[PDB]
Design a binder for this molecule. Sequence first.
Ligand code: CLA
Ligand code: CLA
Ligand code: CLA
Ligand code: CLA
Ligand code: CLA
Ligand SMILES: CC1=C(/C=C/C(C)=C/C=C/C(C)=C/C=C/C=C(C)/C=C/C=C(C)/C=C/C2=C(C)CCCC2(C)C)C(C)(C)CCC1
Ligand SMILES: CC1=C(C/C=C(\C)CCC[C@H](C)CCC[C@H](C)CCCC(C)C)C(=O)c2ccccc2C1=O
Ligand code: SF4
Ligand code: SF4
Lengths: 165, 107, 732, 80, 143, 107, 64
Amino acid sequence: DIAGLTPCSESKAYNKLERKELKVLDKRLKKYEPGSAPYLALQATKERTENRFKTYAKQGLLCGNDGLPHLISDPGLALRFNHAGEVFIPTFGFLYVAGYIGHVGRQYIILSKEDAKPTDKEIILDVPLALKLAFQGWAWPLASIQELRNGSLLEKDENITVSPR
Amino acid sequence: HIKPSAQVVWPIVGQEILNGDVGGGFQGIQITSGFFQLWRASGITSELQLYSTAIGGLVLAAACFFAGWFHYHKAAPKLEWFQNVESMLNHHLAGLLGLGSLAWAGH
Amino acid sequence: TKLFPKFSQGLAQDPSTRRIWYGLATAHDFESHDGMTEENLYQKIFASHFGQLAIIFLWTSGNLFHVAWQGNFEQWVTDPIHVRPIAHAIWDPHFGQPAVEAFTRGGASGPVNIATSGVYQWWYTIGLRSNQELYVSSVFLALVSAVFLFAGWLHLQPNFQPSLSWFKDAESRLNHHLAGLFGVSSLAWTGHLVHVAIPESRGQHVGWDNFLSVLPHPQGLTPFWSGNWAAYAQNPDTASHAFGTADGSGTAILTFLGGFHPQTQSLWLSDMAHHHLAIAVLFIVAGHMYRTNFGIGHRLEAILEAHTPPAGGLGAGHKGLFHTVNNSLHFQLGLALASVGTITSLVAQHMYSLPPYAYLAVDFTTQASLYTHHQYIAGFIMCGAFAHGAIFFIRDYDPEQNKGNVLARVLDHKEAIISHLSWVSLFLGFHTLGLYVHNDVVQAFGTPEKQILIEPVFAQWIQAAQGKSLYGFDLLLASSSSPAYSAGQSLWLPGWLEAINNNQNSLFLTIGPGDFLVHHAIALGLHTTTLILVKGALDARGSKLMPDKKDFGYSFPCDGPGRGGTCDISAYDAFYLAVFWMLNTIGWVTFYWHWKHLTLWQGNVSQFDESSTYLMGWLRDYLWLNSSQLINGYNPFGMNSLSVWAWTFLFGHLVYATGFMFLISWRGYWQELIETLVWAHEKTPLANLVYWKDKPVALSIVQARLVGLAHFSVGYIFTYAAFLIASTAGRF
Amino acid sequence: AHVVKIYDTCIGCTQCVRACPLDVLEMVPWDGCKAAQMASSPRTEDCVGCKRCETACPTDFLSVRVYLGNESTRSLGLAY
Amino acid sequence: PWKQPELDPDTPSPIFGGSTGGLLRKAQVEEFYVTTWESPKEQIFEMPTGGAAIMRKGPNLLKLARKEHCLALTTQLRTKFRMSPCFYRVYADGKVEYLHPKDGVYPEKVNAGRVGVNQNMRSIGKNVDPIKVKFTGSEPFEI
Amino acid sequence: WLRDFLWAQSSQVIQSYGSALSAYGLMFLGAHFVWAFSLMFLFSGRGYWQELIESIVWAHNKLRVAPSIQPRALSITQGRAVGVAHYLLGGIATTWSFFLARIIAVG
Amino acid sequence: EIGPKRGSLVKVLRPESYWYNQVGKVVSVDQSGIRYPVVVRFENQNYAGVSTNNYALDEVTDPP
Ligand code: CLA
Ligand code: CLA
Ligand code: CLA
Ligand code: CLA
Ligand code: CLA
Ligand SMILES: CC1=C(/C=C/C(C)=C/C=C/C(C)=C/C=C/C=C(C)/C=C/C=C(C)/C=C/C2=C(C)CCCC2(C)C)C(C)(C)CCC1
Ligand SMILES: CC1=C(C/C=C(\C)CCC[C@H](C)CCC[C@H](C)CCCC(C)C)C(=O)c2ccccc2C1=O
Ligand code: SF4
Ligand code: SF4
């Protein structure tokens, strides 16, 4: 109960939104026979709606004055209270994949640059080396840290094109 | 009383709301091309006939692609063949347009 | 050879129609004028500044005269909550009979126009009651405008033109302006406030006939010569007090209760009196700092050269920078414009939450128009500041004069700054648009609980630190045991806490996830505008595509189709592209302000809280719902007073579209069309006798961008002002 | 009219004079290059600033530079 | 060239129809340009301001309102037929000017008979900043 | 024209959310996006974008992810083509979504 | 003879050049005493499209 947001399990507007969605979904149910395939699809949609409302509740999620769940972004506050699953763990979850793509792109760029006419390698990809680097990029932050200390990651600006101001 | 519909979406991510209640115990995207009106003008009753038309169209599409491959890579016409403007006009006036119009009138 | 461009002989040699446009555009670009020295340039700038001052004073004198003549200021004074302000009468002979009848608003006889400028609230707050006083104000401001015009004429004659070093006097100008232009000016303002407005707010008329017979405080300056300044805050105005009378009032001239007046919904007059008195005292103290003819003071170059951190942190530090600011007028202009725009933005963000005028918060359209006007003024002044900084970088910048200093080092790694600005702009735009589109489609599938509502925790945490107890954070100044709450607990805490915990006012409104998303979109707009303006400023003199940009002037079209294409390569072009992003960003901030305040005034804040998350709801409940009264101004069935607003809305659309006409098409197709029209006129009967003297030529590319930007911004401003005023005034 | 300047970086491919359809540029003998040639602009008052010589210039940076400003009836390309 | 040639009033002109693109009132008020060449036979060329015109075996005469039209026609003739023509300028008072090479062997050659003008011995980018030449009337590239 | 055609109609496009035709509202706003995104390629030029690309190239050069192919800004004709294509696609999809939603929710 | 070896990799320090702080290959060095005798070839084109340029003696040093 932070920032004046009630939990989703004990919110009246959350349940009123659930009842409203169940009402409109059951409105379309009266136009089809129960043994039809649109009825089965509508029943599966209603089951997915009920499962989503149940799983969104009782998970630490909270909402305020709207019936729509809110996300807590401050670290520590999302760690002392059970809210790290909203954005805190997705932050490291995205950064792992984001650093994965950046690392395999860097290794492919470095590997292709030590080859005759490297401009062709960007439009003519090679599969075995790219796929080998794709499956050799799980430890991207471990390769990134070791290259940072020793200068292989970076480059001094004496061989870097700089503006003539 | 039944709105036409010929595109059915998947239930993957919230798209089940797009399968609108078009009537006739069917749900899908309400189409706007008017293909149902054309299939009522050109007398078409069952879905078997539409299946046959689709398979024939696929066969003619494969034939057209093979024709392009043949008429370029295998047997390419010369410039004098393309410069026969009178034959082109006669064959695409009497042949293409006229033969298609007569075939459609007969159908 | 003509002489209409007198400042530019070369422009007078142009036989085409380009001479008139370029003569009008380079009319006050004195630095590029033919045969102009530095001292005469500074003197011309002094005369032009005096002319602008005279124009400003004449404009406000005319505003006073028009309000005193055709306004309803007395009726507004008698009843501010009911009677509407009136700006000027409408004498348009093309008006119809229903048109005259439908514009006699505010209880008037003739056709009049409702004032949204807010001068009625301001003049009622400062003690102006009768229109005689407004007439005297108008004639006095006209007199001072004539005085300023004469002074501008005075400093152009021999034995009166100041020297070059007089303008370059840096320490004494700062001393005098801080001490006098701010200090004793604020002291005179708070003296006038205490003498006139404080008794006029308590039913005591103070004028030039009797201000020497009445007294501001009953103690009569005995607190000032003694130390007992607490006597001035002994009996402040109570909660049950009216601004036009003395019902339950007190005799206090300087107080600090804080908060707002319970009746007028505005800051207390004595609060502003002590505020301007303290600001006056502090500014007079700070104005005795820089070095003058006397042996004491501070020298600017000494402070600049002394502030060099060791170990090469800033290289040479701020050394060699005094002459850079002094010699380059564009540096001073850019700094002044940056500070003016920042202060204007601060003003916009601070009058709406803290209304300084009585019954200003009640007038919703007045507050909205004032906020939007000063925000757009601040943004345009920001764009001018960055453009003139680029002009400094290209025109007058010597790397040899300041080598290794902060300026040269900033220019040294300019690519890093531009790249990081581009990264943060791209990242903000990518993620903000991602969640906006995500919440749009999630709302479209009939399930709005799946949208990503990131609750703003940092700003609500700040609001809890500032006294908002709605969020329930156990923080300082919100808990009774905190030292921040105990400090000032009897000074201004119970007023500020009562004002900030009341949701009916505009002080620190509650913010939801949509508020957070629109705030980060605003940050994205500021970041992208900063990115383009900073990149144009740093690339103003050199770039890898074109190192010699300093040799082509600040405002040049291009370099040609070579090297892949060099379209819009100038820093002027960077400014011209940045004005569009400035317009979009201020449109975003004013959309946010207008929609949140409109939902506050209508009482349905839940609609804004649940509808500002997704962009379709933004469009539907702002641009479509509030425009119902706008487009019904002159409906064929019935026409009402919103006819000027719908007409101005469509006018802004048309001028926006003419801006598009100048912006899409470029010169080179237009030259051939104009050549065909030349052949049409020259080679026809009964019209070949009439021949042009200036040759018709197409608009130049820089001129094309300028006129496209001008029509774009004019249409943008007019259509948004029309929509905002019509939407706010149709309901209330 | 416009100002056309040629710097010492020119080495004489005699192609900047072919790309100019206004006879502004001419080629003079020189000694600072292998080709012993250097571009010159005798009729610089007849230039419009079309920068075709800049497109034809192969040196980095360009040896020939055209600067806009002070336009006239011939530099504006009007036949009227 | 070896001797500066003066155009002859007697020379014929190619047969052409009425074209809207041509001489304007600037020919009357200001100067206009005149192009001359000597032909081996009757060939078809395209004027820079009109359509197609059959030219005369022998001398020919073209009048163009702009010098750019004259050099466009010159380049077209030199590319298509190795023609090598020359154009002139005729002022309002009757003054005749020679702009196509005064040396006569074209700007593509050198001829060791022309003096370098508007040439800077310094490198591009070595020019001083505009602050160093401020309030002087001289541009950095004009030094 | 404005009030009684573009405002009297399109009330079903904005309220299409939660219904069968909400995809038309999504398409409407995406068309607004693409129509508005085109004005970059229409108003702007190439030299500013080339200099920005140079700064980004320096950023990628600092930590050695420099592509072998040199990143260049779009050509002036290329930029005009991108601008007109995005503008036309956005306008066509805007009118398509508005027309189809209005004629489906009413007709 | 007066310049670097033919075919050796060199670094260009010309500020206004596109290849500032870049590495190029020497293709020819003129011995006639001209303004810019050191002619080098670069692997990457400029914005114009060319790949070779000439520089003076003071603008060419060996890269580290
Ligand atoms: C207690 C020990 C101590 C400490 C902590 C400092 C600390 C400091 N001194 Mg120092 N000082 C000391 C002892 C100490 N000094 C002694 C003994 C002397 C001799 C008397 C001095 C004399 C001295 C002088 C004369 C000056 C300083 C200054 C400074 C400050 C700037 C340092 C610098 O190089 O810039 C930081 C280093 C940089 C390389 C700057 C990088 C800045 C980046 C690029 C900007 C990033 C912007 C980024 C986008 C922002 C994002 C924000 C977001 C909202 C957008 C720094 C805080 C300077 C000062 O006043 O500055 C405030 C200064 O002029 N000092
Ligand atoms: C409303 C229309 C609109 C939009 C959306 C943009 C968006 C953008 N402009 Mg802008 N601009 C506009 C109008 C617009 N502009 C106009 C009218 C002008 C006046 C000429 C400018 C002038 C201008 C300048 C001068 C600059 C920008 C820049 C930018 C970028 C800022 C970075 C950012 O916010 O993150 C990204 C923002 C986004 C909106 C993301 C768009 C991409 C999304 C994810 C869709 C991608 C495609 C999608 C995955 C589907 C794939 C298939 C599809 C391609 C078919 C961004 C790409 C700056 C830039 O590019 O520097 C980095 C810059 O310097 N613009
Ligand atoms: C994997 C290669 C790679 C790497 C490591 C980087 C790294 C960087 N770029 Mg770059 N970028 C790349 C490709 C790459 N970029 C491509 C392909 C483009 C063209 C679309 C750009 C366009 C671009 C711009 C316009 C900007 C950056 C910026 C940045 C910096 C910010 C980090 C970031 O996420 O930027 C954000 C990057 C993007 C939004 C580009 C995403 C495109 C995809 C993800 C790249 C695909 C590469 C591919 C999968 C690799 C092949 C794998 C191999 C096995 C075959 C950083 C130095 C910014 C900067 O200057 O910061 C200082 C900046 O303004 N980049
Ligand atoms: C009467 C004979 C006849 C017929 C019916 C056609 C029909 C056609 N010709 Mg034409 N053509 C003919 C004689 C004929 N040609 C002659 C004599 C010449 C030489 C002068 C040409 C040279 C020619 C050129 C150069 C081009 C055509 C093209 C086309 C097609 C235009 C597409 C269209 O409008 O949509 C109508 C589309 C359809 C009706 C789809 C069905 C297509 C079927 C399979 C074609 C069957 C007709 C064919 C003549 C049957 C004999 C071929 C046999 C060897 C299998 C159309 C199918 C264009 C093309 O490449 O398309 C092939 C084209 O650019 N024609
Ligand atoms: C008080 C601050 C201030 C000062 C002292 C200056 C002074 C100067 N600036 Mg700066 N500038 C400012 C604010 C300021 N400007 C702002 C706010 C902007 C952003 C809009 C700019 C943008 C800017 C640029 C981009 C350039 C200058 C230039 C100049 C110089 C000449 C401009 C001039 O007078 O031409 C007189 C110009 C006119 C008379 C034309 C007026 C047309 C206006 C602007 C269009 C308005 C639209 C519309 C028609 C208005 C009427 C509405 C309609 C419905 C009736 C001069 C040094 C130029 C320079 O240094 O020369 C190279 C230059 O390139 N400035
Ligand atoms: C281009 C250029 C230029 C320009 C620039 C600009 C235009 C800028 C701007 C800038 C800006 C516009 C800035 C701003 C800033 C700000 C700041 C820096 C602020 C701060 C603040 C603070 C620090 C606060 C604090 C506090 C307090 C006191 C109270 C409450 C709480 C708190 C804590 C928040 C020039 C001329 C130089 C020249 C060169 C180039
Ligand atoms: C923005 C802009 C650019 C810069 C634009 C460039 C360089 C083109 C960028 C094309 C991108 C790289 C295509 C691919 C886009 C995304 C990477 C696709 C993402 C797909 C997801 C699945 C990841 C110009 O070059 C330009 C030139 C002339 C006039 C106007 C402009 C102009 O406005
Ligand atoms: S800008 Fe054009 S007309 Fe002028 S010298 Fe260059 S190529 Fe010739
Ligand atoms: S195009 Fe440039 S480098 Fe080549 S001969 Fe002409 S001026 Fe010299």
